[PDB]
Amino acid sequence: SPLPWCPHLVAVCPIPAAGLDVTQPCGDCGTIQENWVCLSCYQVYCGRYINGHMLQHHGNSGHPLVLSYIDLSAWCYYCQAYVHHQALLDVKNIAHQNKFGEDMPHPH
């Protein structure tokens, strides 16, 4: 149902060894709600339903792909579609572990 590939996956960068914090607030407004993490630079900003700071970040950086801290979906702002691919497996997994803990039935 998401796209199996997009031309912007090349811009997905290595996950920091620091890992991900799915409860990290928006870097601009500080909201705890509807945050996304940028898969290029790993700054965290809010979704369109709050103050739209991730969309603003896309506009001012050109960074393509972002991961939702709500449902762990990856969205590309250029393709205007959700994407799932091997390049996104590391981040989605580390995010899932941080969000739900290790005691989960989901394949890591």
Binding site feature residues = 6, 8, 26, 29, 38, 41, 46, 53, 57, 63, 76, 79
User: Does residue 58 bind Zn ion (CB under 5 A)?
Assistant: no
In this chain, which of 10, 41, 70, 89 binds Zn ion, going by CB under 5 A?
41
* CB contact at 8 A, 78 and 64: yes
Q: Which is nearer to Zn ion, 30 or 100 (CB)?
A: 30
How deeply is 78 buried, as exposed, middle or buried, from its count of CB atoms within 10 A (0-12, 13-18, 19+)?
middle
**Binding region for Zn(2+):** 6, 8, 26, 29, 38, 41, 46, 53, 57, 63, 76, 79
Beta-strand relationship, 74-76 and 81-82: antiparallel
In the complex, minimum distance from the CB of residue 96 to Zn ion, in angstroms, rounded to a whole number = 21
Q: Which two tokens stand for residue 64?
A: 């393509």
> Which of 24, 102, 107 is closest to 70 using CA atoms?
24
Positions touching Zn ion (CB under 5 A) are 6, 8, 26, 28-29, 38, 40-41, 46, 51, 53, 61, 63, 76, 78-79
